[PDB]
mmCIF file of C-alpha atoms and ligand atoms in Angstrom:
data_model
loop_
_atom_site.group_PDB
_atom_site.id
_atom_site.type_symbol
_atom_site.label_atom_id
_atom_site.label_comp_id
_atom_site.label_asym_id
_atom_site.label_seq_id
_atom_site.Cartn_x
_atom_site.Cartn_y
_atom_site.Cartn_z
ATOM 1 C CA UNK A 2 96.391 64.096 99.989
ATOM 2 C CA UNK A 3 96.292 66.415 96.348
ATOM 3 C CA UNK A 4 98.740 64.242 94.361
ATOM 4 C CA UNK A 5 96.257 61.092 95.061
ATOM 5 C CA UNK A 6 93.691 63.274 94.776
ATOM 6 C CA UNK A 7 94.278 64.159 91.309
ATOM 7 C CA UNK A 8 94.619 61.053 90.523
ATOM 8 C CA UNK A 9 91.690 59.680 91.954
ATOM 9 C CA UNK A 10 89.707 62.404 90.451
ATOM 10 C CA UNK A 11 91.025 62.337 86.908
ATOM 11 C CA UNK A 12 90.623 58.371 86.658
ATOM 12 C CA UNK A 13 87.181 58.778 87.103
ATOM 13 C CA UNK A 14 85.852 62.352 85.121
ATOM 14 C CA UNK A 15 84.465 63.918 88.611
ATOM 15 C CA UNK A 16 86.760 67.144 87.632
ATOM 16 C CA UNK A 17 82.580 68.404 87.109
ATOM 17 C CA UNK A 18 81.296 66.814 89.629
ATOM 18 C CA UNK A 19 83.992 68.101 92.219
ATOM 19 C CA UNK A 20 83.904 71.230 90.761
ATOM 20 C CA UNK A 21 80.348 71.828 90.817
ATOM 21 C CA UNK A 22 80.266 70.338 94.570
ATOM 22 C CA UNK A 23 82.458 73.767 95.827
ATOM 23 C CA UNK A 24 79.565 76.009 93.655
ATOM 24 C CA UNK A 25 76.631 74.248 96.047
ATOM 25 C CA UNK A 26 79.033 74.848 99.494
ATOM 26 C CA UNK A 27 80.695 77.992 98.508
ATOM 27 C CA UNK A 28 79.597 81.079 101.243
ATOM 28 C CA UNK A 29 76.234 83.272 100.296
ATOM 29 C CA UNK A 30 76.697 86.659 101.737
ATOM 30 C CA UNK A 31 74.730 89.391 100.760
ATOM 31 C CA UNK A 32 76.156 91.929 98.393
ATOM 32 C CA UNK A 33 73.729 94.699 99.188
ATOM 33 C CA UNK A 34 76.186 97.969 98.362
ATOM 34 C CA UNK A 35 77.096 96.653 94.619
ATOM 35 C CA UNK A 36 73.383 96.191 94.339
ATOM 36 C CA UNK A 37 72.465 99.856 94.940
ATOM 37 C CA UNK A 38 70.904 101.280 91.890
ATOM 38 C CA UNK A 39 73.768 104.234 91.936
ATOM 39 C CA UNK A 40 76.342 101.431 91.510
ATOM 40 C CA UNK A 41 74.805 99.944 88.725
ATOM 41 C CA UNK A 42 77.370 101.639 85.884
ATOM 42 C CA UNK A 43 79.979 100.731 88.276
ATOM 43 C CA UNK A 44 79.822 97.035 87.658
ATOM 44 C CA UNK A 45 81.062 95.231 84.496
ATOM 45 C CA UNK A 46 78.742 91.915 85.172
ATOM 46 C CA UNK A 47 75.794 91.740 86.730
ATOM 47 C CA UNK A 48 76.127 88.915 88.837
ATOM 48 C CA UNK A 49 79.612 89.036 89.976
ATOM 49 C CA UNK A 50 79.540 91.042 92.932
ATOM 50 C CA UNK A 51 81.893 91.566 95.975
ATOM 51 C CA UNK A 52 79.853 90.717 99.373
ATOM 52 C CA UNK A 53 79.465 93.875 101.632
ATOM 53 C CA UNK A 54 81.731 92.539 104.641
ATOM 54 C CA UNK A 55 84.733 92.157 102.345
ATOM 55 C CA UNK A 56 84.607 95.118 99.745
ATOM 56 C CA UNK A 57 87.133 97.403 99.687
ATOM 57 C CA UNK A 58 85.860 100.745 100.612
ATOM 58 C CA UNK A 59 87.053 103.848 98.666
ATOM 59 C CA UNK A 60 87.571 106.688 101.001
ATOM 60 C CA UNK A 61 85.650 109.321 99.713
ATOM 61 C CA UNK A 62 82.252 110.359 101.177
ATOM 62 C CA UNK A 63 80.626 110.956 97.762
ATOM 63 C CA UNK A 64 80.637 107.092 97.041
ATOM 64 C CA UNK A 65 82.929 104.729 98.688
ATOM 65 C CA UNK A 66 82.000 101.657 95.867
ATOM 66 C CA UNK A 67 84.237 99.332 94.156
ATOM 67 C CA UNK A 68 83.828 96.037 92.831
ATOM 68 C CA UNK A 69 86.741 94.430 94.653
ATOM 69 C CA UNK A 70 87.193 92.302 97.467
ATOM 70 C CA UNK A 71 89.844 92.137 100.396
ATOM 71 C CA UNK A 72 90.716 88.089 100.010
ATOM 72 C CA UNK A 73 92.199 87.722 103.674
ATOM 73 C CA UNK A 74 93.984 84.427 104.381
ATOM 74 C CA UNK A 75 94.349 84.439 108.314
ATOM 75 C CA UNK A 76 95.954 81.191 108.433
ATOM 76 C CA UNK A 77 98.478 81.554 105.023
ATOM 77 C CA UNK A 78 98.907 85.639 106.640
ATOM 78 C CA UNK A 79 98.428 86.985 102.806
ATOM 79 C CA UNK A 80 96.069 89.758 101.656
ATOM 80 C CA UNK A 81 94.864 89.880 98.027
ATOM 81 C CA UNK A 82 92.115 92.400 96.283
ATOM 82 C CA UNK A 83 90.519 90.628 93.581
ATOM 83 C CA UNK A 84 88.916 93.066 91.380
ATOM 84 C CA UNK A 85 86.756 93.615 88.031
ATOM 85 C CA UNK A 86 88.584 95.181 84.929
ATOM 86 C CA UNK A 87 88.130 98.323 85.721
ATOM 87 C CA UNK A 88 85.193 99.769 83.258
ATOM 88 C CA UNK A 89 85.706 103.745 81.445
ATOM 89 C CA UNK A 90 84.261 105.396 84.735
ATOM 90 C CA UNK A 91 85.939 102.972 87.091
ATOM 91 C CA UNK A 92 89.596 103.847 86.229
ATOM 92 C CA UNK A 93 90.110 106.226 88.794
ATOM 93 C CA UNK A 94 88.565 104.618 91.334
ATOM 94 C CA UNK A 95 90.577 101.918 90.558
ATOM 95 C CA UNK A 96 94.258 103.842 91.329
ATOM 96 C CA UNK A 97 92.359 105.334 94.634
ATOM 97 C CA UNK A 98 92.364 102.053 95.596
ATOM 98 C CA UNK A 99 95.551 100.668 94.746
ATOM 99 C CA UNK A 100 97.090 103.854 96.193
ATOM 100 C CA UNK A 101 94.630 104.443 99.120
ATOM 101 C CA UNK A 102 95.337 100.446 100.166
ATOM 102 C CA UNK A 103 99.328 100.783 100.067
ATOM 103 C CA UNK A 104 99.092 98.472 96.934
ATOM 104 C CA UNK A 105 102.636 97.863 95.361
ATOM 105 C CA UNK A 106 102.049 95.502 92.444
ATOM 106 C CA UNK A 107 98.992 94.908 90.358
ATOM 107 C CA UNK A 108 98.653 91.478 88.238
ATOM 108 C CA UNK A 109 96.159 91.345 84.853
ATOM 109 C CA UNK A 110 96.115 87.673 83.910
ATOM 110 C CA UNK A 111 93.431 89.338 80.705
ATOM 111 C CA UNK A 112 94.126 91.174 77.700
ATOM 112 C CA UNK A 113 91.984 94.317 76.863
ATOM 113 C CA UNK A 114 90.086 92.313 73.930
ATOM 114 C CA UNK A 115 89.462 88.860 74.322
ATOM 115 C CA UNK A 116 87.076 87.110 71.787
ATOM 116 C CA UNK A 117 86.034 90.788 69.907
ATOM 117 C CA UNK A 118 84.740 92.091 73.548
ATOM 118 C CA UNK A 119 86.553 95.157 75.461
ATOM 119 C CA UNK A 120 87.507 93.240 79.035
ATOM 120 C CA UNK A 121 88.744 95.857 80.694
ATOM 121 C CA UNK A 122 89.449 99.776 80.051
ATOM 122 C CA UNK A 123 93.220 100.633 79.077
ATOM 123 C CA UNK A 124 93.691 102.162 82.855
ATOM 124 C CA UNK A 125 97.645 102.755 82.520
ATOM 125 C CA UNK A 126 99.798 105.109 80.188
ATOM 126 C CA UNK A 127 101.073 103.038 76.943
ATOM 127 C CA UNK A 128 104.016 105.708 76.375
ATOM 128 C CA UNK A 129 106.323 107.128 78.733
ATOM 129 C CA UNK A 130 105.414 110.440 76.979
ATOM 130 C CA UNK A 131 101.548 110.116 77.462
ATOM 131 C CA UNK A 132 101.732 109.777 81.407
ATOM 132 C CA UNK A 133 97.553 109.843 82.219
ATOM 133 C CA UNK A 134 95.205 111.827 85.005
ATOM 134 C CA UNK A 135 92.578 111.070 86.503
ATOM 135 C CA UNK A 136 90.810 114.083 87.227
ATOM 136 C CA UNK A 137 87.825 112.345 89.710
ATOM 137 C CA UNK A 138 90.751 110.634 92.120
ATOM 138 C CA UNK A 139 93.098 113.730 91.774
ATOM 139 C CA UNK A 140 95.990 110.995 90.896
ATOM 140 C CA UNK A 141 98.232 110.673 87.971
ATOM 141 C CA UNK A 142 100.144 107.583 86.235
ATOM 142 C CA UNK A 143 103.127 107.959 84.210
ATOM 143 C CA UNK A 144 105.049 105.069 82.001
ATOM 144 C CA UNK A 145 108.330 104.134 83.914
ATOM 145 C CA UNK A 146 110.131 101.458 81.972
ATOM 146 C CA UNK A 147 108.427 97.697 80.702
ATOM 147 C CA UNK A 148 110.046 94.571 79.959
ATOM 148 C CA UNK A 149 108.490 92.529 77.303
ATOM 149 C CA UNK A 150 108.477 88.819 77.214
ATOM 150 C CA UNK A 151 106.960 86.447 74.494
ATOM 151 C CA UNK A 152 103.946 86.411 76.676
ATOM 152 C CA UNK A 153 103.352 88.399 79.542
ATOM 153 C CA UNK A 154 105.067 92.216 80.618
ATOM 154 C CA UNK A 155 106.238 93.820 83.259
ATOM 155 C CA UNK A 156 105.706 97.442 83.661
ATOM 156 C CA UNK A 157 107.257 99.817 86.046
ATOM 157 C CA UNK A 158 104.999 102.522 87.053
ATOM 158 C CA UNK A 159 105.093 105.749 89.105
ATOM 159 C CA UNK A 160 101.516 107.024 91.076
ATOM 160 C CA UNK A 161 101.422 110.611 92.172
ATOM 161 C CA UNK A 162 98.743 111.743 94.405
ATOM 162 C CA UNK A 163 98.638 115.255 93.257
ATOM 163 C CA UNK A 164 97.356 116.224 96.141
ATOM 164 C CA UNK A 165 99.974 115.686 98.514
ATOM 165 C CA UNK A 166 102.298 115.538 95.247
ATOM 166 C CA UNK A 167 103.159 111.965 97.097
ATOM 167 C CA UNK A 168 104.830 109.089 94.764
ATOM 168 C CA UNK A 169 104.907 105.437 95.095
ATOM 169 C CA UNK A 170 106.429 102.867 92.277
ATOM 170 C CA UNK A 171 103.282 100.469 91.365
ATOM 171 C CA UNK A 172 104.820 96.807 89.527
ATOM 172 C CA UNK A 173 102.591 95.827 87.040
ATOM 173 C CA UNK A 174 102.359 92.052 85.780
ATOM 174 C CA UNK A 175 100.329 91.682 82.619
ATOM 175 C CA UNK A 176 100.303 87.821 81.844
ATOM 176 C CA UNK A 177 99.032 88.402 78.611
ATOM 177 C CA UNK A 178 98.781 84.407 76.991
ATOM 178 C CA UNK A 179 95.671 82.964 79.583
ATOM 179 C CA UNK A 180 92.822 82.665 77.757
ATOM 180 C CA UNK A 181 89.493 83.637 79.366
ATOM 181 C CA UNK A 182 87.479 80.765 80.996
ATOM 182 C CA UNK A 183 91.075 78.799 79.919
ATOM 183 C CA UNK A 184 94.207 77.948 81.720
ATOM 184 C CA UNK A 185 97.460 78.544 81.091
ATOM 185 C CA UNK A 186 99.773 76.924 78.426
ATOM 186 C CA UNK A 187 101.358 75.059 81.021
ATOM 187 C CA UNK A 188 101.890 74.570 85.023
ATOM 188 C CA UNK A 189 105.772 76.027 84.143
ATOM 189 C CA UNK A 190 104.735 78.909 82.211
ATOM 190 C CA UNK A 191 101.886 79.992 84.962
ATOM 191 C CA UNK A 192 104.711 79.135 87.984
ATOM 192 C CA UNK A 193 107.600 81.257 85.919
ATOM 193 C CA UNK A 194 105.216 84.057 85.977
ATOM 194 C CA UNK A 195 103.986 83.656 89.667
ATOM 195 C CA UNK A 196 107.232 83.605 90.883
ATOM 196 C CA UNK A 197 108.340 86.899 88.955
ATOM 197 C CA UNK A 198 105.199 88.429 90.917
ATOM 198 C CA UNK A 199 106.695 86.826 93.782
ATOM 199 C CA UNK A 200 110.330 87.556 93.189
ATOM 200 C CA UNK A 201 109.022 91.649 92.899
ATOM 201 C CA UNK A 202 108.342 91.540 96.784
ATOM 202 C CA UNK A 203 105.127 92.601 95.935
ATOM 203 C CA UNK A 204 103.668 90.334 97.906
ATOM 204 C CA UNK A 205 105.456 91.246 101.261
ATOM 205 C CA UNK A 206 103.737 91.716 103.992
ATOM 206 C CA UNK A 207 105.110 95.299 104.172
ATOM 207 C CA UNK A 208 102.973 96.140 101.628
ATOM 208 C CA UNK A 209 99.528 96.522 101.443
ATOM 209 C CA UNK A 210 97.636 93.554 99.550
ATOM 210 C CA UNK A 211 98.689 93.022 95.584
ATOM 211 C CA UNK A 212 95.961 93.647 93.569
ATOM 212 C CA UNK A 213 94.784 90.804 91.101
ATOM 213 C CA UNK A 214 92.378 91.009 88.046
ATOM 214 C CA UNK A 215 91.478 89.808 84.838
ATOM 215 C CA UNK A 216 88.059 90.506 83.467
ATOM 216 C CA UNK A 217 85.082 89.695 86.151
ATOM 217 C CA UNK A 218 88.178 89.002 89.188
ATOM 218 C CA UNK A 219 87.158 85.726 89.570
ATOM 219 C CA UNK A 220 88.045 83.240 87.391
ATOM 220 C CA UNK A 221 91.527 83.481 86.497
ATOM 221 C CA UNK A 222 92.266 86.310 89.050
ATOM 222 C CA UNK A 223 90.858 83.029 91.857
ATOM 223 C CA UNK A 224 92.881 80.210 90.212
ATOM 224 C CA UNK A 225 96.039 82.629 90.375
ATOM 225 C CA UNK A 226 95.444 83.583 94.402
ATOM 226 C CA UNK A 227 94.108 79.889 95.356
ATOM 227 C CA UNK A 228 97.582 78.685 93.207
ATOM 228 C CA UNK A 229 99.725 81.172 95.378
ATOM 229 C CA UNK A 230 98.010 80.478 98.729
ATOM 230 C CA UNK A 231 98.122 76.564 98.457
ATOM 231 C CA UNK A 232 101.812 77.263 97.953
ATOM 232 C CA UNK A 233 102.461 79.159 100.631
ATOM 233 C CA UNK A 234 100.672 77.512 103.718
ATOM 234 C CA UNK A 235 102.485 74.647 101.945
ATOM 235 C CA UNK A 236 105.907 76.540 102.507
ATOM 236 C CA UNK A 237 104.876 77.659 106.129
ATOM 237 C CA UNK A 238 104.522 74.155 107.175
ATOM 238 C CA UNK A 239 106.937 72.484 104.770
ATOM 239 C CA UNK A 240 104.523 69.964 104.528
ATOM 240 C CA UNK A 241 102.432 69.539 101.156
ATOM 241 C CA UNK A 242 99.974 66.994 102.447
ATOM 242 C CA UNK A 243 98.709 69.324 104.470
ATOM 243 C CA UNK A 244 97.095 71.661 102.265
ATOM 244 C CA UNK A 245 93.638 70.154 101.185
ATOM 245 C CA UNK A 246 93.215 72.594 97.949
ATOM 246 C CA UNK A 247 89.630 72.285 98.134
ATOM 247 C CA UNK A 248 89.224 73.326 101.631
ATOM 248 C CA UNK A 249 91.216 76.718 100.615
ATOM 249 C CA UNK A 250 89.598 77.452 97.969
ATOM 250 C CA UNK A 251 86.077 77.363 100.055
ATOM 251 C CA UNK A 252 87.719 79.581 102.841
ATOM 252 C CA UNK A 253 88.908 82.319 99.627
ATOM 253 C CA UNK A 254 85.061 82.308 98.542
ATOM 254 C CA UNK A 255 83.924 83.694 101.598
ATOM 255 C CA UNK A 256 85.503 86.749 100.926
ATOM 256 C CA UNK A 257 84.577 86.649 96.798
ATOM 257 C CA UNK A 258 81.896 84.579 95.226
ATOM 258 C CA UNK A 259 82.913 82.517 92.256
ATOM 259 C CA UNK A 260 86.527 82.210 92.406
ATOM 260 C CA UNK A 261 87.670 79.516 89.301
ATOM 261 C CA UNK A 262 84.725 79.443 87.189
ATOM 262 C CA UNK A 263 85.554 75.911 85.492
ATOM 263 C CA UNK A 264 86.209 72.299 86.288
ATOM 264 C CA UNK A 265 89.686 72.585 83.780
ATOM 265 C CA UNK A 266 90.691 75.525 85.881
ATOM 266 C CA UNK A 267 90.401 74.078 89.351
ATOM 267 C CA UNK A 268 92.571 70.962 87.712
ATOM 268 C CA UNK A 269 94.882 73.424 87.031
ATOM 269 C CA UNK A 270 95.254 74.674 90.181
ATOM 270 C CA UNK A 271 96.269 70.721 91.406
ATOM 271 C CA UNK A 272 98.778 71.189 88.582
ATOM 272 C CA UNK A 273 100.127 74.191 89.654
ATOM 273 C CA UNK A 274 100.531 73.608 93.064
ATOM 274 C CA UNK A 275 102.005 69.797 92.842
ATOM 275 C CA UNK A 276 104.688 71.363 90.551
ATOM 276 C CA UNK A 277 105.376 74.265 92.796
ATOM 277 C CA UNK A 278 105.691 71.942 95.398
ATOM 278 C CA UNK A 279 109.059 71.002 93.867
ATOM 279 C CA UNK A 280 110.834 74.442 94.585
ATOM 280 C CA UNK A 281 108.857 74.255 97.952
ATOM 281 C CA UNK A 282 110.605 71.235 99.215
ATOM 282 C CA UNK A 283 114.454 71.912 98.418
ATOM 283 C CA UNK A 284 113.929 71.662 94.611
ATOM 284 C CA UNK A 285 116.558 74.206 93.564
ATOM 285 C CA UNK A 286 116.724 74.334 89.700
ATOM 286 C CA UNK A 287 113.155 74.164 88.364
ATOM 287 C CA UNK A 288 112.532 77.537 88.694
ATOM 288 C CA UNK A 289 114.910 77.388 85.646
ATOM 289 C CA UNK A 290 113.341 74.729 84.484
ATOM 290 C CA UNK A 291 110.169 76.593 84.187
ATOM 291 C CA UNK A 292 112.096 79.480 82.809
ATOM 292 C CA UNK A 293 113.249 77.490 79.635
ATOM 293 C CA UNK A 294 109.849 75.733 78.967
ATOM 294 C CA UNK A 295 107.633 79.064 79.586
ATOM 295 C CA UNK A 296 109.617 80.280 76.723
ATOM 296 C CA UNK A 297 109.304 84.128 77.655
ATOM 297 C CA UNK A 298 111.809 84.737 75.038
HETATM 298 O O1 527 B 1 88.270 85.158 83.991
HETATM 299 C C1 527 B 1 87.975 83.929 83.323
HETATM 300 O O2 527 B 1 88.595 82.637 83.344
HETATM 301 C C2 527 B 1 86.809 83.844 82.839
HETATM 302 O O3 527 B 1 86.453 85.648 82.944
HETATM 303 C C3 527 B 1 84.719 85.637 83.457
HETATM 304 C C4 527 B 1 84.730 86.495 82.790
HETATM 305 C C5 527 B 1 85.470 87.220 80.696
HETATM 306 O O4 527 B 1 85.821 87.458 80.696
HETATM 307 O O5 527 B 1 84.017 87.456 80.033
HETATM 308 S S1 527 B 1 82.771 86.626 82.372
HETATM 309 C C6 527 B 1 82.829 85.772 83.077
HETATM 310 C C7 527 B 1 81.180 85.432 84.396
HETATM 311 C C8 527 B 1 80.581 86.564 84.191
HETATM 312 C C9 527 B 1 78.877 86.493 84.747
HETATM 313 C C10 527 B 1 78.681 85.095 85.722
HETATM 314 C C11 527 B 1 79.700 84.083 85.728
HETATM 315 N N1 527 B 1 79.702 82.874 86.463
HETATM 316 C C12 527 B 1 78.762 82.317 87.277
HETATM 317 C C13 527 B 1 78.873 81.298 88.184
HETATM 318 C C14 527 B 1 77.891 81.426 89.492
HETATM 319 N N2 527 B 1 78.818 81.806 90.327
HETATM 320 S S2 527 B 1 78.453 81.341 91.951
HETATM 321 O O6 527 B 1 79.483 82.491 92.706
HETATM 322 O O7 527 B 1 79.243 80.183 91.783
HETATM 323 C C15 527 B 1 77.403 82.070 92.844
HETATM 324 C C16 527 B 1 77.417 82.092 94.052
HETATM 325 C C17 527 B 1 77.486 83.027 94.807
HETATM 326 C C18 527 B 1 77.235 82.626 96.568
HETATM 327 C C19 527 B 1 77.392 81.494 96.890
HETATM 328 C C20 527 B 1 76.994 80.240 95.942
HETATM 329 C C21 527 B 1 76.994 80.238 94.834
HETATM 330 C C22 527 B 1 78.382 83.486 90.239
HETATM 331 C C23 527 B 1 79.080 83.528 88.515
HETATM 332 C C24 527 B 1 81.232 84.430 84.963
HETATM 333 C C25 527 B 1 83.915 85.390 83.772
HETATM 334 BR BR1 527 B 1 84.324 84.139 85.463
#
């Protein structure tokens, strides 16, 4: 049980040891397609690739590769697409995937520039007057509106399939203060953001899977998804004792390597889930508390 286990690991200092065990046991499947010579310029990191069995395939005969995996949580009944931050040459691919997979929401847990590095291309329009057109995949993207908060921004976008003139609204959730290789300021600010994603309907089973990305699509993205899945499992059974975080984390790693980069990110997962359980189990006031504590205004 997660709260006694958390106090146990903390009391010792075995978060490094605990975290390492996950790396030692994680699933190791082939990533043949991602390692093909022609896809070298489609991967941001040499050591972070999608497994062939769970990779998202683009619907085009030319090259159907994109560095993204489909994390399908059977028991929880919720899917995500975890992908790397789009490269200058893969933004078209990125939006093709969003469209083909019927995604309604896109979560961005990083900033374009972190520690002096360009962690992600500017794949979305920053001003309504200047929409973006991806000639390679034939899609248009327009900024419709945005709600800027102290540490995250929510953008309303419109994606048009230029070929069929079809249109869809895409909600963009940009967490701007989650440090790379780090953890959120507090469980409150994290959960406030997550619930913002939840309340938008983007995680609904009536849409395609939500697309989640930071830079490599495994560290911060993994932390976010693990916390969401754990709270969902718990929710489905209304029994926080039946949720084994490490077990579910392992299960997520069958669909994409390296989910959760650091021992502290894992420690924070526990933290976030433990706090989120309050809401899951009936506490109707915590939500607002999180909003206050997050200082979004
Ligand atoms: O968002 C963040 O918090 C940080 O984001 C980032 C980055 C960023 O924002 O700059 S770079 C990065 C990164 C890049 C290359 C390799 C590894 N790390 C390796 C470690 C070992 N693993 S693994 O998956 O544990 C290896 C393995 C594969 C299958 C089975 C067992 C082990 C692969 C990635 C990490 C991560 Br994540």
